[PDB]
Design a protein around this ligand. Sequence first.
Ligand SMILES: [Mg+2]
Ligand SMILES: [Mg+2]
Ligand SMILES: [Mg+2]
Ligand SMILES: [Mg+2]
Ligand SMILES: [Mg+2]
Ligand SMILES: [Mg+2]
Ligand SMILES: [Mg+2]
Ligand SMILES: [Mg+2]
Ligand SMILES: [Mg+2]
Ligand SMILES: [Mg+2]
Ligand SMILES: [Mg+2]
Ligand SMILES: [Mg+2]
Ligand SMILES: [Mg+2]
Ligand SMILES: [Mg+2]
Ligand SMILES: [Mg+2]
Ligand SMILES: [Mg+2]
Ligand SMILES: [Mg+2]
Ligand SMILES: [Mg+2]
Ligand SMILES: [Mg+2]
Ligand SMILES: [Mg+2]
Ligand SMILES: [Mg+2]
Ligand SMILES: [Mg+2]
Ligand SMILES: [Mg+2]
Ligand SMILES: [Mg+2]
Ligand SMILES: [Mg+2]
Ligand SMILES: [Mg+2]
Ligand SMILES: [Mg+2]
Ligand SMILES: [Mg+2]
Ligand SMILES: [Mg+2]
Ligand SMILES: [Mg+2]
Ligand SMILES: [Mg+2]
Ligand SMILES: [Mg+2]
Ligand SMILES: [Mg+2]
Ligand SMILES: [Mg+2]
Ligand SMILES: [Mg+2]
Ligand SMILES: [Mg+2]
Ligand SMILES: [Mg+2]
Ligand SMILES: [Mg+2]
Ligand SMILES: [Mg+2]
Ligand SMILES: [Mg+2]
Ligand SMILES: [Mg+2]
Ligand SMILES: [Mg+2]
Ligand SMILES: [Mg+2]
Ligand SMILES: [Mg+2]
Ligand SMILES: [Mg+2]
Ligand SMILES: [Mg+2]
Ligand SMILES: [Mg+2]
Ligand SMILES: [Mg+2]
Ligand SMILES: [Mg+2]
Ligand SMILES: [Mg+2]
Ligand SMILES: [Mg+2]
Ligand SMILES: [Mg+2]
Ligand SMILES: [Mg+2]
Ligand SMILES: [Mg+2]
Ligand SMILES: [Mg+2]
Ligand SMILES: [Mg+2]
Ligand SMILES: [Mg+2]
Ligand SMILES: [Mg+2]
Ligand SMILES: [Mg+2]
Ligand SMILES: [Mg+2]
Ligand SMILES: [Mg+2]
Ligand SMILES: [Mg+2]
Ligand SMILES: [Mg+2]
Lengths: 144, 207, 62, 124
Amino acid sequence: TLKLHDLRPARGSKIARTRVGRGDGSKGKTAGRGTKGTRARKQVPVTFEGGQMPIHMRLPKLKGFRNRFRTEYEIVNVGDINRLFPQGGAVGVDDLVAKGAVRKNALVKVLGDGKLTAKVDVSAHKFSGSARAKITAAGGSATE
Amino acid sequence: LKIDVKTPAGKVDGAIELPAELFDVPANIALMHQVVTAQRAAARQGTHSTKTRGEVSGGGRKPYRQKGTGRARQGSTRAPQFTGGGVVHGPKPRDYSQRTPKKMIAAALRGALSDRARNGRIHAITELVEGQNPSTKSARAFLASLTERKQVLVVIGRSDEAGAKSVRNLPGVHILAPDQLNTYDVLRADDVVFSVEALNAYIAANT
Amino acid sequence: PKAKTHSGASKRFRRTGTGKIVRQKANRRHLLEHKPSTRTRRLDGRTVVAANDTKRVTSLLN
Amino acid sequence: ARVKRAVNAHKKRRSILKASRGYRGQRSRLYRKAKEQQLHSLNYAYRDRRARKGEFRKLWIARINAAARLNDITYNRLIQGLKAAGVEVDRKNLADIAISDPAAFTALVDVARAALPEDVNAPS
RNA sequence: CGCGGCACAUCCACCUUGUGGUGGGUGUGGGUAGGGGAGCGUCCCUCAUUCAGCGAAGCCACCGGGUGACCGGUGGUGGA
RNA sequence: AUGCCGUGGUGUAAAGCGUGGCAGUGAGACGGCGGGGGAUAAGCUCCGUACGUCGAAAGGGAAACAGCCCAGAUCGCCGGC
RNA sequence: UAGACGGUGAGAGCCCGGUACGCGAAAACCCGGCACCUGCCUAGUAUCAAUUCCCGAGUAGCAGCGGGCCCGUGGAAUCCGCUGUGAAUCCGCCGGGACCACCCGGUAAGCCUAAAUACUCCUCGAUGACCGAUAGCGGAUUAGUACCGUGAGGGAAUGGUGAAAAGUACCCCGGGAGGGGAGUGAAAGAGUACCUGAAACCGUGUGCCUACAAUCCGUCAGAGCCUCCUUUUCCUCUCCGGAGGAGGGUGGUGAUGGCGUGCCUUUUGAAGAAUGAGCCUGCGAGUCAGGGACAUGUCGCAAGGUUAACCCGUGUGGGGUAGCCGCAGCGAAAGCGAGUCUGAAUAGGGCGACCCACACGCGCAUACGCGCGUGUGAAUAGUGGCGUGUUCUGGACCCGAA
Ligand SMILES: [Mg+2]
Ligand SMILES: [Mg+2]
Ligand SMILES: [Mg+2]
Ligand SMILES: [Mg+2]
Ligand SMILES: [Mg+2]
Ligand SMILES: [Mg+2]
Ligand SMILES: [Mg+2]
Ligand SMILES: [Mg+2]
Ligand SMILES: [Mg+2]
Ligand SMILES: [Mg+2]
Ligand SMILES: [Mg+2]
Ligand SMILES: [Mg+2]
Ligand SMILES: [Mg+2]
Ligand SMILES: [Mg+2]
Ligand SMILES: [Mg+2]
Ligand SMILES: [Mg+2]
Ligand SMILES: [Mg+2]
Ligand SMILES: [Mg+2]
Ligand SMILES: [Mg+2]
Ligand SMILES: [Mg+2]
Ligand SMILES: [Mg+2]
Ligand SMILES: [Mg+2]
Ligand SMILES: [Mg+2]
Ligand SMILES: [Mg+2]
Ligand SMILES: [Mg+2]
Ligand SMILES: [Mg+2]
Ligand SMILES: [Mg+2]
Ligand SMILES: [Mg+2]
Ligand SMILES: [Mg+2]
Ligand SMILES: [Mg+2]
Ligand SMILES: [Mg+2]
Ligand SMILES: [Mg+2]
Ligand SMILES: [Mg+2]
Ligand SMILES: [Mg+2]
Ligand SMILES: [Mg+2]
Ligand SMILES: [Mg+2]
Ligand SMILES: [Mg+2]
Ligand SMILES: [Mg+2]
Ligand SMILES: [Mg+2]
Ligand SMILES: [Mg+2]
Ligand SMILES: [Mg+2]
Ligand SMILES: [Mg+2]
Ligand SMILES: [Mg+2]
Ligand SMILES: [Mg+2]
Ligand SMILES: [Mg+2]
Ligand SMILES: [Mg+2]
Ligand SMILES: [Mg+2]
Ligand SMILES: [Mg+2]
Ligand SMILES: [Mg+2]
Ligand SMILES: [Mg+2]
Ligand SMILES: [Mg+2]
Ligand SMILES: [Mg+2]
Ligand SMILES: [Mg+2]
Ligand SMILES: [Mg+2]
Ligand SMILES: [Mg+2]
Ligand SMILES: [Mg+2]
Ligand SMILES: [Mg+2]
Ligand SMILES: [Mg+2]
Ligand SMILES: [Mg+2]
Ligand SMILES: [Mg+2]
Ligand SMILES: [Mg+2]
Ligand SMILES: [Mg+2]
Ligand SMILES: [Mg+2]
């Protein structure tokens, strides 16, 4: 039987800790610093480039504004419908959450990437223009 | 795969079929070493503590002037190079519990119980003492008819109190509830002895 | 605690779909009369942050 | 776990101080001064194991040269003579024959003197 | 260069033909800052096992061992 | 004359390049050859050099002697050139 | 139902105090029930009417100056102060981020309110991969004492004989102190200077060397002397004994020859007459937190992965979908979407998707491969743990000013 003295970690998982500043056969007196300046006793901040105007102040700001009232959709492709529902039938928003194609509690949106060959009948929000084509050309319908 | 149920002072009445998705699982040793480590890490208390130089009593003033004395400059009497000063990077109260995921915890428990079932180390009984008052003498003799081994995990239901009291101070016997099975107490044990009500409650909680 | 990102660098750099970091180009806000339209078209749009800046810029965004 | 240092630390202190027995002053008594001297003593020993290969050769050549001049030849033309005659005896044993058996060293000079060219100053 | 020991890289052979091992060539192996790899010793806990008032630890000495940190044996002292 | 860029052959394991982790360094020194400053002084000072050594290189020679000449120390040998 | 823990002359479930488990309260206190007692209520209700009155005043609002809100005076709402000015009672008034209109929501300038939360001088019961006398509280010991300071203040050092004191009767030397002999004890190689008893440092004894030599004090070569074991005949008392010498071998010492410029730090370069170190013992410097960040080793699940607070349990066990990351990008944005922005563009460019390694074939192309089915069944992916490196915020490797 396996006992508590037969358990051991996977090879490569547990590696040894580097104990620094413990003599000349390891990382010796200065512990990897070497210097006599700032880097020997302190950290240098990332924003500081020695005194010139840094990269986050030389460059202009990215143009524009963020839309506060932006609505966001969760995206499903019509080629994913063909793989998830190879028998066709009715496809709702609840049917896509259980199949893992889409997140919960969010407005869905069918896009038209892929090849739909099944006869599905899908209710969603805001169909794409090339997704309304492939659903009816496969034999089904698409309502809001 | 099939465990016959024995009775205190008697013979085999029935049998239990162990489901193979729960008692015939291939044992992952790298997985069990992580779960057993994480339980003994959560078992710690971590009540170890020292004082730093700001927490040792006194030590506010500069003990003498910096220049002109021929002594080394010191700044405080509770610096770590002094006798009685603060500890540098000493112990502070820690918690060592880890965040082992649920699927990894349940798979190590099945892998340890599968290794005992594969070796004939699972035993099913109906109850420990056949009456209502406890007796360590009658309950010790019945476990000796099962095992000759030093470590025994008795898994019996929480409502059964006369059985639990009967095997408390037996050395090398550990008691726990069926919903508290874990990898450390099963790998420490040589023989897992279920009750017939306790084994049916473990299987029904995992289908 | 929790790491605060850098406010002034997140207004200047963003990421594409593959993970490249893009920026805009200087010498374009004012004094634009003596600059020919071959120059303002060169300074138009976005370019990828150069390889010698991508380690410090990635740590400002994180 | 607070760890006392002394059971570990005294291990290298006892061995440095045993290697320094027979030193005079603080160099056999004090660990810090015994250890500075063990650094020099093992560098000196390394340096001298590679030097005594040349020191013993310098002793042997001096004794081959002394024994050859008794037999009216120099060391110079003796080494030319034994290379010319195909005598591959080394200088360790050629300075050992010169002491324990002087008659056999005279028999080696006559082999070296015969194989030597007729005019050694003439070009090859 | 000769004779003998070690180590690393690479190549050629095989044994579950790289998780590796064995064998045979050739090459390489000064080193500060610094980078990478692999280990020794002290202490505490868990499981397993084994010693100990017929003498544990700690200490002292002598004799030995390992490529290094270091180790082992035997004896004296000692008392868990 | 050299040097530089391209290309075709031939040679050469530990070259080159791309992208990540972790650096250290950013006080140099003398010697050869080319030049500036200085008085064509300096163990002077400032540059050039797929130049060298020291830095960070032990061993042999230069009496001694970081930088010059020879030579790059895995360990052992009371061998040889 | 007791194998908790401690004691007892050495590791005790059965020797002791206890433990599991049970039993117990004059009185005081606390909690609750039932009474006394104390209060409260027994006239409104319903319909219709719009005629009136009321619905918290030096208040709201407005302005000036300030405070605070993510919001540093800004286009600055909502909230608070001080100064001036100063309403209205429902068709009223206030809020919905300047403001106006419509609409929705709510009734300021009166009061009270449990539980969920924070804390521990103190009491009781437990616990530790916490400390074990330079540690742990400054304080195991006169401890906030002794001592220092006019004062506010600062602030030490100091534990262990043995199982039992059986703490050495008596005799000797000595003024005593201290010892010697006796005696006690398992042991004074435990004697109130007391468990073990390390190093520095200080003596005594003994082996070898050293008073004509210039020594970073060692190292290699090397004679002799001393010591203790062994090979060959001899003292053959021969089992002896090793008795002395010859040979070898350990251990100690070192006449004499050669070579040889301390360690650290810091420097172009230090034996340096640059710095630090009298010596020994003990202590004295990359740690910890966090579903942080980037990168990796490794494990689980996998187009998914995973819970947080919380809930239930004797625990490390079981629940818990809120959330987070992956799942489609492009654009200032509206937006559109395998594309999309710019543009007059069916122009080019940016960013983002996009397999020919391949069987049949389709107009086929010298055989080549453009396009699409069935795959020939192409080669990929994330996310949660735990290691490790760097890193962010904290004293952040440690010590040090004026
Ligand atoms: Mg750690
Ligand atoms: Mg040092
Ligand atoms: Mg330093
Ligand atoms: Mg530096
Ligand atoms: Mg400036
Ligand atoms: Mg303070
Ligand atoms: Mg101070
Ligand atoms: Mg303290
Ligand atoms: Mg859980
Ligand atoms: Mg502009
Ligand atoms: Mg223009
Ligand atoms: Mg000596
Ligand atoms: Mg030589
Ligand atoms: Mg070499
Ligand atoms: Mg090397
Ligand atoms: Mg180094
Ligand atoms: Mg004894
Ligand atoms: Mg110990
Ligand atoms: Mg030893
Ligand atoms: Mg011993
Ligand atoms: Mg001992
Ligand atoms: Mg690199
Ligand atoms: Mg410079
Ligand atoms: Mg410097
Ligand atoms: Mg220069
Ligand atoms: Mg010149
Ligand atoms: Mg110069
Ligand atoms: Mg030059
Ligand atoms: Mg040299
Ligand atoms: Mg070099
Ligand atoms: Mg030289
Ligand atoms: Mg010389
Ligand atoms: Mg020669
Ligand atoms: Mg006990
Ligand atoms: Mg009792
Ligand atoms: Mg009102
Ligand atoms: Mg106002
Ligand atoms: Mg304000
Ligand atoms: Mg007013
Ligand atoms: Mg509004
Ligand atoms: Mg009200
Ligand atoms: Mg109130
Ligand atoms: Mg409350
Ligand atoms: Mg409390
Ligand atoms: Mg308490
Ligand atoms: Mg103390
Ligand atoms: Mg006073
Ligand atoms: Mg007496
Ligand atoms: Mg006596
Ligand atoms: Mg007695
Ligand atoms: Mg004793
Ligand atoms: Mg004493
Ligand atoms: Mg003592
Ligand atoms: Mg003399
Ligand atoms: Mg001289
Ligand atoms: Mg200088
Ligand atoms: Mg340097
Ligand atoms: Mg000095
Ligand atoms: Mg000096
Ligand atoms: Mg000094
Ligand atoms: Mg975007
Ligand atoms: Mg395009
Ligand atoms: Mg993975």
